[PDB]
């Protein structure tokens, strides 16, 4: 008897969640779980904390599956703080909870769905070596994990036979006052036909407006951006130049009713696995106030059993930082008008694009030989 709660923010098909809760086979595992669904708005951190406290005090909740619809990022940090304070684990399946955080402390029970910065950096180079763009430059601002991105990018390209000639790096800071002139002067140093960017949505919009003022965004330069710049597919800032390439999680074929079942299955299978061998189960009085003395029963073993699970012929083996190790990504391109289209999806490290030659969007010639 383990209680699991699910929290939704914003509009969602509530009846679909109820129908899909009992959608898998959970008979041969002694979990007998109960599903509790509660809906609330995005009022504030205080409301979220109060709701979580009330729920965990109400009926024997040992874990929370959290959903969200807004694109805010600090909600992940707040949830990580809560998970650090109380030993119960929580899961982020969609929304702002899917954003990757800087560095979870050594005592946090918190996991997210979605690739990290390093895997997206790796795929940005797998995309490059297929349409033969061997010349590129990188520009980025101050964001958590910015050093890891450039470090991995530089490490990958210096241990291969193919020749990547990296033309200068830019780590400009846009938070300075009256530094816009300096930023505009520095942006003129870019010469490679391929540009890599790592910035927040508003930072990306400001930088793109500045670049369009300079004019190096019209015909021959192509930009590649990470997942977090998009955030919401529908909300097009209208400042993004045509031809932008981005990598995003496959939300088109993987909506939400399946994610709830997948998240519940992780907890159920982990609890079943840790119960049988160890003949124990963490069932403390999950108090809300005066929780410093409630840390008597260590749940670190449950954490060790949370990082290696599988079900229905799928791999969900996590890592030390708390992310997939095996996500399912897609590649999206912004066409002539403001809209996003699927170009190619790759699984198990095998790139598969639906195009063979990049559509150009005259001094481009053809050569025949023998």
């Amino acid at each position: 008897s383990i209680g699991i709660a699910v929290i939704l923010v914003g509009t969602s098909d509530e009846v679909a969640i109820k129908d899909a809760h009992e959608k898998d086979d959970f008979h041969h595992l002694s979990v007998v779980p109960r599903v509790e669904l509660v809906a609330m708005n995005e009022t504030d951190p205080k409301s979220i904390i109060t709701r979580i406290c009330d729920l965990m005090s109400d009926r024997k909740i040992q874990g929370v599956v959290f959903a969200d619809d807004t694109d805010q990022e600090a909600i992940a940090q707040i949830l990580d703080f809560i998970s650090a304070q109380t030993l119960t684990p929580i899961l982020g399946i969609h929304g702002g909870s899917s954003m990757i955080m800087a560095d979870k402390d050594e005592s946090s029970m918190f996991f997210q769905f979605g690739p990290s910065i390093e895997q997206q950096a790796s795929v940005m180079l797998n995309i490059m070596e297929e349409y033969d763009w061997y010349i590129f430059s990188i520009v980025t601002t101050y964001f958590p994990g910015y050093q890891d991105f450039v470090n991995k990018i530089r490490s990958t390209i210096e241990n291969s036979f193919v020749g990547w000639e990296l033309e200068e790096v830019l780590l400009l800071d846009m938070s300075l006052d009256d530094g816009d002139s300096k930023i505009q002067n520095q942006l003129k140093k870019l010469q490679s036909p391929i540009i890599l960017l790592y910035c927040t949505k508003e930072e990306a919009t400001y930088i793109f407006e500045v670049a369009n003022s300079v004019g190096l965004t019209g015909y021959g330069y192509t930009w590649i951006v990470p997942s977090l710049v998009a955030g919401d597919t529908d909300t097009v800032p209208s400042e993004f130049p045509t031809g932008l390439i981005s990598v995003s999680y496959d939300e088109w074929d993987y909506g939400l009713p399946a994610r709830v079942r997948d998240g519940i299955a992780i907890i159920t299978t982990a609890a079943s696995d840790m119960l049988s061998e160890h003949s124990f189960i963490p069932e403390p009085k999950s108090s809300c106030y005066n929780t410093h003395e409630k840390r008597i029963y260590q749940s670190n073993m449950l954490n060790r059993y949370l990082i290696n699970v599988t079900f229905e012929g799928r791999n969900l083996s996590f890592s030390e930082d708390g992310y997939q190790m095996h996500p399912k990504l897609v590649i999206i391109l912004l066409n002539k008008e403001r809209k996003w289209e699927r170009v190619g999806k790759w699984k198990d490290k095998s790139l598969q694009m639906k195009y063979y030659v990049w559509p150009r969007m005259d001094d481009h010639l053809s050569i025949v030989t023998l």
Partner: protein
């Protein structure tokens, strides 16, 4: 117009002192005083602080440590809650190096310097006594890593690499094997930056191995010279101290002064908008605080009880005062001061460990090679 600030203290008498200080500063656009107490849990702290954030729509928050010894988690709720709104926060008695990280804590300022500057002032002793070869041991923690990195970065200019860097796991009870390796080495200067508990473990093991005889030098810091370490502590240890570290009234008497100069230059510049008082209501970011941080950090303060206070581009106080603190015959006596960038002697004479009265070379020539 009317502008109000906020603060949280750990004593009702301290609250009255803060009220008296703000009443005195009113003679220098009228200010206000808001203060609350501390709770033994972080979630209640966050709930109260955003509840009290709604109370008066504060512009700056002052935080102080409680009588608890560790208090490592006490500043965390306020920092997270304030950074959720990008509201700058000034700290008074926080010394852990975690809060110096600009990534997790975007808005945070320090009234006292961190331990990294202690590691930096360790350099002047070597500079003035011609000690070029040292052995340093630090614990496996985020605290030690920053100090080691800063020390080796500072020593990079001198092009004098330390011979050995060795570490031990935190919270251990046996370090005999590790101390064995350093005994074989050829350096006689030991610098340790560990926790208070680990200070007792290392000091006990050093005595057994005859490690603290003649011809040895120990350079320690604030944490391992206080506490229960003096129960088992050899003579001749050279420590460190701060002139006005523990006088919370001295800081407060001028902490409100430096912020008062900043608001004068901000209230009449442009586009001033009060940060929202809607704890529950608004979830956006206040426009005021990206520019407020820039002006505040560069606000030079002419003169104060602790001298000139000028902030670098790190949110940490610069030009602190250190007293080279010495122990002889089971009591501590001052022997010098750290004048900003250099040191001067004093009337008293330092007695080195082992009873010898000289300046040990810190070197023992070896006559066997490999």
């Amino acid at each position: 117009k009317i502008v109000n600030i906020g603060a949280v203290l750990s004593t009702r008498k301290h609250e009255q002192m803060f009220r008296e200080a703000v009443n005195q500063a009113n003679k220098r656009i009228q200010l206000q005083a808001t203060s609350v107490t501390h709770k033994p849990n972080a979630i209640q702290m966050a709930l109260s602080v955003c509840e009290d954030l709604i109370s008066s729509q504060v512009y700056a928050i002052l935080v102080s440590h409680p009588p608890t010894p560790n208090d490592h988690f006490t500043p965390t709720p306020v920092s997270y809650t304030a950074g959720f709104y990008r509201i700058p926060v000034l700290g008074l008695t926080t010394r852990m190096s975690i809060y110096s990280d600009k990534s997790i804590h975007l808005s945070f300022l320090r009234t006292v310097p961190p331990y990294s500057h202690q590691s930096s002032v360790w350099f002047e002793m070597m500079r003035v006594y011609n000690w070029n070869h040292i052995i340093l041991l630090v614990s496996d923690d985020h605290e030690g890593r920053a100090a080691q990195k800063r020390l080796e970065t500072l020593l990079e200019e001198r092009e004098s690499k330390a011979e050995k860097v060795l570490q031990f796991d935190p919270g251990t009870k046996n370090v005999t094997a590790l101390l064995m390796e350093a005994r074989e080495l050829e350096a006689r200067v030991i610098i340790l930056s560990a926790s208070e508990d680990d200070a007792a473990t290392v000091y006990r093991a050093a005595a057994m191995l005859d490690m603290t005889g003649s011809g040895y030098v120990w350079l320690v810091g604030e944490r391992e010279i206080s506490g229960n370490a003096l129960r088992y502590a050899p003579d001749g240890i050279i420590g460190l101290q701060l002139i006005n570290g523990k006088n919370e009234s001295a800081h407060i008497s001028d902490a409100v002064g430096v912020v008062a100069q900043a608001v004068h230059e901000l209230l009449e510049k442009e586009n001033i908008t009060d940060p929202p008082r809607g704890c529950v209501g608004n979830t956006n970011i206040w426009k005021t605080g990206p520019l407020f941080k820039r002006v505040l950090m560069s606000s030079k303060y002419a003169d104060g009880v602790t001298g000139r206070v000028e902030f670098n581009e790190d949110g940490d106080r610069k030009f602190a005062q250190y007293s080279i603190m010495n122990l002889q015959n089971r009591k501590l006596v001052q022997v010098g001061i750290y004048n900003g960038t250099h040191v001067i002697p004093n009337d008293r004479k330092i007695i080195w460990p082992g009873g010898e009265t000289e300046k040990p070379r810190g070197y023992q020539m070896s006559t066997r090679l490999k």
